[PDB]
Amino acid sequence: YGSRTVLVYIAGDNSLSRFASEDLNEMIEGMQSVDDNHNNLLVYMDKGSNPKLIRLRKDKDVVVQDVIATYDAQNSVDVDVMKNVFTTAFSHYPADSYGVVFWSHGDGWLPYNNPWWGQDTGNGDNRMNIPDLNEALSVAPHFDFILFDACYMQSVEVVYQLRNRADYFIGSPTEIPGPGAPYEVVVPALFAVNSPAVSIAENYYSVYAKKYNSTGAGISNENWTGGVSISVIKSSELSALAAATRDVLQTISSILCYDPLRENNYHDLMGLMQSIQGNSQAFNHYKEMYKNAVIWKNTTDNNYCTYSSGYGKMVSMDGFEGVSTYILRENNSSQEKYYRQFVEWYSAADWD
Amino acid sequence: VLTX
């Protein structure tokens, strides 16, 4: 046993494949401040060829990649694949506490029909639906934290759907930079004895905050000057948030949008409630419950966002409260029909 | 430049 086992799960058989090895090199540098006697950093790495599950171990001042298991080319967002990875990882390395990092593409709660989080383009375009992710997580231990190193995952719908899987969720409600986490300082925070979720957030944010330029001048995949936005949700507080939401309900251009250059699927949850609320008592209580659930947040004044074309620009994060939501537009669309049927948040927060 |  160790004190903690953290699995970094890299579904990188997709456009992001070029970032994976670099993050691995960062992770290896981060193990220098970590005592591997009690702490297990595991990495499942799929860049397209033959995936591997390793553990990083220190000899002296050198970190060595011990191979736990190797795999044929496989769909890393298939439920039984992820389950097998999980079962193996946490069986070989039990611990007193557990963490996990989901590294891939992401698009919140949105439905995707396989021939959502994570993409594998190895044999067709495969993506994981959040109910499928919740099923895979069911064979896993309960986590102290989940870090989504993936776009748009800090959604109240996603976190509520997965609330029984972890104590804390770390992510961005908007797009996450290509380079993702600075794992040279996030890795020791993954094993912080006190408040790892906050530690992870502070260390993640701080590197991007320091090379931030307001116009994203000189931004590149090798040098991200476009900033970042991050928050931490405490899952044990979501039920009260849902209950506080229902009470508010008993009484769009102006709400901050996290994908303003694309489909406008994502808006700031607090911004939504401020504009819908018809009673200060109900609302001032909602803000308290909101404060209890969203315990950490920070953003640079702008973030870089992209159009569907792939091009992009800096967008103002004015109004940022750290969590996104879907605003029902009543349009009979397929994603709303899915929302009203399979997103628990819809019935939990009483969106009637 | 890419995002995730």
Following DSSP, what letter does each residue of A212-233 receive, concatenated? --TT-TT-BTTB--S--EEEEE
Q: What is the Cα–Cα distance from A79 to A137, expressed in whole angstroms?
A: 9
CB-CB under 8 Å, B2 with A105? no
**Are residues A223 and A260 located together in one domain of the fold?**
no
Residue A67 lies in a domain: yes
Q: In CATH, what number is assigned to the domain containing residue A132?
A: 3.40.50.11970
Cβ–Cβ gap A16/B2 under 8 Å = yes
Q: How is residue A154 written in tokens? A: 């800090």
Triad A92, A32, A148: Cα angle to 5°: 60
Within 8 A of A304 by CB-CB distance, chain B residues are 1, 3
Q: Which residues of A3-37 are buried (b: 16+ CB within 10 A; e: fewer)?
A: ebbbbbbbbbbbebeebbeebbebbbebbeebebe
Q: What burial class does residue A226 get, using C-beta atoms within 10 Å of its C-beta: 0-12 exposed, 13-18 middle, 19+ buried?
A: buried
Which chain B residue has the Cα nearest residue A148? B4
Q: Do B1 and A105 touch (CB under 8 A)?
A: no
Phi, psi torsion values for A323, nearest 5 degrees: -140, 140
Give a yes or no: residue A299 inside a domain. no
The nearest alpha carbon in chain B to A225 belongs to B1
The amino acid at residue A267 is: H
Residues of B in contact with A226 (CB under 8 A): 1
A192: in domain: yes
What are the CA-CA distances from residue A113 to residues A76, A124, A126, A334, A335 (Å)?
16, 12, 8, 11, 11
Residues of B in contact with A19 (CB under 8 A): 2
Nearest CB among A176, A304, A312 relative to B4 is that of A176
For residues A77 and A121, membership in a common domain is answered with yes
Query: Do the Cβ atoms of B4 and A219 come within 8 Å?
Result: no
Which domain, by its residues, includes A270? 237-294+304-348
A281 within domain boundaries: yes
- B4 with A220: Cβ contact below 8 A: no
Q: Which of A204, A219, A236 delimits the end of a domain?
A: A236
Domains contained in chain A, number: 2
Inter-chain residue contact A16 with B4, CB threshold 8 Å: yes
* Helix, coil or strand: residue A135: helix
Report the C-alpha gap between A158 and A269 in whole angstroms. 13
How many whole angstroms separate alpha carbon A143 and alpha carbon A6?
9
Q: In angstroms, rounded to a whole number, what is the distance separating the alpha carbons of residues A230 and A222?
A: 21
Which residues in chain A have Cβ-Cβ distances shorter than 8 Å to B3?
151, 175-178, 304-306, 312
Please name the amino acid found at residue A250.
Q
Residues A200 and A324 occupy one common structural domain: no
- d(CA A318, nearest CA chain B) in Å: 20
- The tokens of A3 are what? 């004190």
Task: Mark whether A196 and A251 lie in a shared domain.
Answer: no
Residues A154, A177 share a domain = yes
- Put simply, the answer to whether B3 touches A177 (Cβ < 8 Å) is yes
Boundary-marking domain end, from A236, A261, A278:
A236
Asked if residue A335 and residue A191 are part of one domain, the reply reads no
The reply to whether A164 and A280 lie within a common domain is: no
Of A104, A175, A220, the CB nearest to B3: A175
Task: Look at residue A272 and tell me if it is in a domain.
Answer: yes
C-alpha A94 chain-centroid distance: 24
Same domain membership, residue A211 and residue A245 = no
- The answer to whether the CB atoms of A221 and B4 lie below 8 A apart is no
- Reference A191, options A64, A42, A39; nearest CA is A39
Q: Are residues A185 and A286 in the same domain?
A: no
Task: Determine whether the interchain pair A106/B4 forms a contact, defined as Cβ–Cβ distance below 8 Å.
Answer: yes
CA distance A225 to A144: 31
Which residue pairs from A213-217 have beta carbons closer than 8 angstroms and sit at least 24 positions apart in sequence? A214/A301, A214/A302, A214/A314, A215/A314, A216/A302, A216/A304, A216/A313, A216/A314
**Which residues of A have a CB under 8 Å from any CB of B?**
15-16, 19, 104-106, 149-151, 175-178, 180, 219-221, 224, 226, 304-306, 312
Q: Do A106 and B1 touch (CB under 8 A)?
A: no
With the C-alpha atoms ordered A19, A26, A259, A339, is the resulting torsion angle positive or negative? positive
Last residue of a domain, which of A207, A236, A265?
A236
Residues in chain B preceding a C-to-N separation beyond 2.5 angstroms (breaks): none
Q: How far apart are CA A6 and CA A146, in angstroms?
A: 10
In chain A, residues with a C-beta closer than 8 Å to the C-beta of B2 are 15-16, 19, 178, 221
Q: Which residue, chain included where needed, has tokens 């044999």? A: A123
Instruction: Looking at the structure, tell me whether residues A56 and A17 fall in a common domain.
Output: yes
Structure tokens at A313: 């620009």
